[PDB]
Amino acid sequence: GWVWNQFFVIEEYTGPDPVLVGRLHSDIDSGDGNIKYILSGEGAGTIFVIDDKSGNIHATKTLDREERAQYTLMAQAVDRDTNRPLEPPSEFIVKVQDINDNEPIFTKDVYTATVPEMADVGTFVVQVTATDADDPTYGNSAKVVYSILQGQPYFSVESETGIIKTALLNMNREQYQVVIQAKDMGGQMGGLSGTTTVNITLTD
Amino acid sequence: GWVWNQFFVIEEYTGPDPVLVGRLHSDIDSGDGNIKYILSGEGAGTIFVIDDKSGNIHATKTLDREERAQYTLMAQAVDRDTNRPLEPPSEFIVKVQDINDNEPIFTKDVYTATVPEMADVGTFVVQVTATDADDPTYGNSAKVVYSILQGQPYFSVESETGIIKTALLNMNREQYQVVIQAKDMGGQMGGLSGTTTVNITLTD
Ligand SMILES: [Ca+2]
Ligand SMILES: [Ca+2]
Ligand SMILES: [Ca+2]
Ligand SMILES: [Ca+2]
Ligand SMILES: [Ca+2]
Ligand SMILES: [Ca+2]
């Protein structure tokens, strides 16, 4: 049930010379260059190039996991001269590994909501949503949390759902402007962040 | 006959933060962290460390292919809680990939040989040997070639065997000092190089 037929590459290779992805290899390759490795499939001969005596596969361009996350390719091993079937062809996959190179992005840049005056504490106002394109296989690198910049103590926001509620009894002033931040990494150090504005209007 | 159960690491990681070697993974890992990956064997828990929820394996120190070229490890997948056998344990290997970080090195720093005067052209004199620790799996990165710095036209050297021969008929002067260079990369651009001296003495 193990899985070994895959290699990994980092999103955003901002480096000088092309990078190695992995190496194909048949146990019959005795090191005398009489065996010819061949790529084929998604990206073969373009994004992914192979040296057919060694088996090394290289990434020719810089890849974005948001554009494509996974390339499925084929691996053959033929006889240098006759090009006969030496090893049956087998599939393998290269995974553009994620980096948290995208901030949370509020669907809207401005929300408009209404809530009644003199409402009890915890009255629902509106729910904001910051989407995050980072889709790591696992990890909290894309875990969005909502916090209230401007609006306290009048309003509280729910860290996980972006639901805004009233937080002061018996509310003088008619319109409040709230600012909510969506920070990834679970809000931890170095997390990226986007913001939005919520223009609430009390009602009678 | 294909071989996928191996990862690669570059010799001489002179980089700031530790590097990723590869990732273990069972097809039953449904992404809910209920599966626990385990390392064991050569270097496990020391040189090579694993995060048991992800499966990522990291190189903690910088490795030298001249010291060790190959580490054989084990891979297990158990149930987070019961630690039952979930996937049978399977071997895999990490290969410290070569860089040409070693020059040719003449066994000796000075050779002493004798050859008769008036000898015919091509008379054997001595054979020098420059060893090269770089042992790439394949490639000419460690291909040593011998060239004659000082000694022409009196002597010629064989590019591949480091055999020195007489190259001038009817040889006035009694002792000649020859200098031979051993350059790797097949002598190509950027190849490293070591040298030696050969003090020859003509005879009657
Ligand atoms: Ca990107
Ligand atoms: Ca990304
Ligand atoms: Ca993110
Ligand atoms: Ca070294
Ligand atoms: Ca080396
Ligand atoms: Ca060398």
CATH number, residue A41: 2.60.40.60
Tokens of B157: 């050297």
In a shared domain, residues A3 and A78: yes
Residues sharing a CB contact under 8 Å with residue A35, sequence separation 6 or more, in sequence order? A26, A28, A29, A77, A78, A79, A80, A86
CA-CA distance, B55 to B91, in Å (whole number)?
15
In a shared domain, residues B133 and B62: no
Q: How far is A2 from chain B (nearest CA, A)?
A: 4
CA-CA distance, B32 to B17, in Å (whole number)?
28
In terms of residues, how long is chain B? 204
CA-CA distance, B3 to A75, in Å (whole number)?
11
In a shared domain, residues B60 and B156: no
Q: Taking CB atoms and an 8 Å cut-off, how many pairs form between chains A and B?
A: 63
CA-CA distance, B179 to B181, in Å (whole number)?
7
One-letter amino acid identity for B76?
Q
**Contact assignment for B25 to A3 by CB distance below 8 Å:** yes
Cα three-residue angle A115-A117-A122, rounded to 5 degrees:
60
**Contact assignment for B87 to A1 by CB distance below 8 Å:** yes
Tokens of A201: 């209007």
In a shared domain, residues B92 and B122: no
Single out the residue in B69, B99, B129 at which a domain terminates: B99
B13 Cα to the center of ligand 6, angstroms:
18
DSSP A52-72: TTT-EEEE-S---TTT--EEE
Best of A2, A8, A34, A52 to disrupt the B interface (most B CBs within 10 Å) is A2
Tell me if B138 sits within 8 A of B152, measured CB to CB.
Answer: no
Range of the domain at A154: 100-204
- Using an 8 Å CB-CB cutoff, list chain B residues near A75: 2
**Contact assignment for B22 to A5 by CB distance below 8 Å:** no
In a shared domain, residues B203 and B104: yes
- Using an 8 Å CB-CB cutoff, list chain B residues near A54: 137-139
In a shared domain, residues B94 and B2: yes
Q: Of B34, B35, B47, which Cα lies nearest the Cα of B7?
A: B47
Q: Of A85, A86, A94, which Cα lies nearest the Cα of A41?
A: A94
| Residue B26 half-sphere exposure toward CB, CA atoms < 13 A | 24
Single out the residue in B99, B128, B144 at which a domain terminates: B99
- Using an 8 Å CB-CB cutoff, list chain A residues near B25: 2-3
Which neighbouring-strand residues pair with A145? Answer: A183
Sheet holding A85-97, edge to edge: A6-10, A85-97, A70-79, A35-41
Candidate from A5, A26, A137 with C-beta closest to B1: A26
| Residue B54: burial class (beta carbons within 10 Å; 0-12, 13-18, 19+) | middle
Residues B86-91: contacts with CB within 8 Å, 24+ apart? B86/B26, B86/B28, B86/B35, B87/A1, B87/A2, B87/B26, B87/B28, B88/A1, B89/B40, B90/A2, B90/B5, B91/B5, B91/B41
**Contact assignment for A8 to B23 by CB distance below 8 Å:** yes
Q: Of A182, A181, A170, A179, which Cα lies nearest the Cα of A198?
A: A179
What backbone phi and psi angles, to 5 degrees, belong to A185? 65, 20
In a shared domain, residues B89 and B113: no
In a shared domain, residues B82 and B71: yes
**Contact assignment for A27 to B139 by CB distance below 8 Å:** no
**Contact assignment for B87 to A2 by CB distance below 8 Å:** yes
SS3 assignment, position B187: helix
Tokens of A130: 């910051």
In a shared domain, residues B131 and B193: yes
Q: Is there a cis peptide before residue B153, judged by omega within 30 degrees of 0? A: yes
- Using an 8 Å CB-CB cutoff, list chain B residues near A11: none
- Looking at the CA of B143, name the nearest ligand: 6
B132 Cα to the center of ligand 5, angstroms:
9
- Using an 8 Å CB-CB cutoff, list chain A residues near B76: none
Q: How far is B137 from chain A (nearest CA, A)?
A: 8
Residue whose token pair is 């005879």: B203
In a shared domain, residues A154 and A113: yes
**Contact assignment for B22 to A8 by CB distance below 8 Å:** yes
**Contact assignment for A4 to B31 by CB distance below 8 Å:** no
Q: Of B26, B54, B25, which Cα lies nearest the Cα of A141?
A: B54
Ion ligand 5, residues whose Cβ is below 5 A away: B 65, 98, 101, 134
CA torsion through residues A180, A185, A189, A190, sign = negative
Header resolution in angstroms: 3.0
Tell me if A155 sits within 8 A of A124, measured CB to CB.
Answer: no
- Using an 8 Å CB-CB cutoff, list chain A residues near B1: 26-28, 77, 87-88
What backbone phi and psi angles, to 5 degrees, belong to A187? 75, 0
Q: Of B47, B56, B143, which Cα lies nearest the Cα of B96?
A: B47
In a shared domain, residues B71 and B45: yes
CA-CA distance, A172 to A50, in Å (whole number)?
72
Q: How many secondary structure helices (H) and strands (E) does chain B include?
A: 0, 16
Say how many C-beta atoms besides its own lie within 10 A of residue A137's C-beta: 16
CA-CA distance, A25 to A54, in Å (whole number)?
8
Single out the residue in B99, B122, B152 at which a domain terminates: B99
Domains of chain A: total: 2
DSSP chain A: -B--SEEEEES----SS-EEEEE--BTT--SSS-EEEEEEETTBTTTEEE-TTT-EEEE-S---TTT--EEEEEEEEEETTT--EEEEEEEEEEEEE-------EES-SEEEEEEETTPPTT-EEEE--EE-----SSSSTT--EEEEEEBTBTEEE-TTT-EEEE-SS-----EEEEEEEEESGGG-TT--EEEEEEEEEEE-
In a shared domain, residues A80 and A133: no
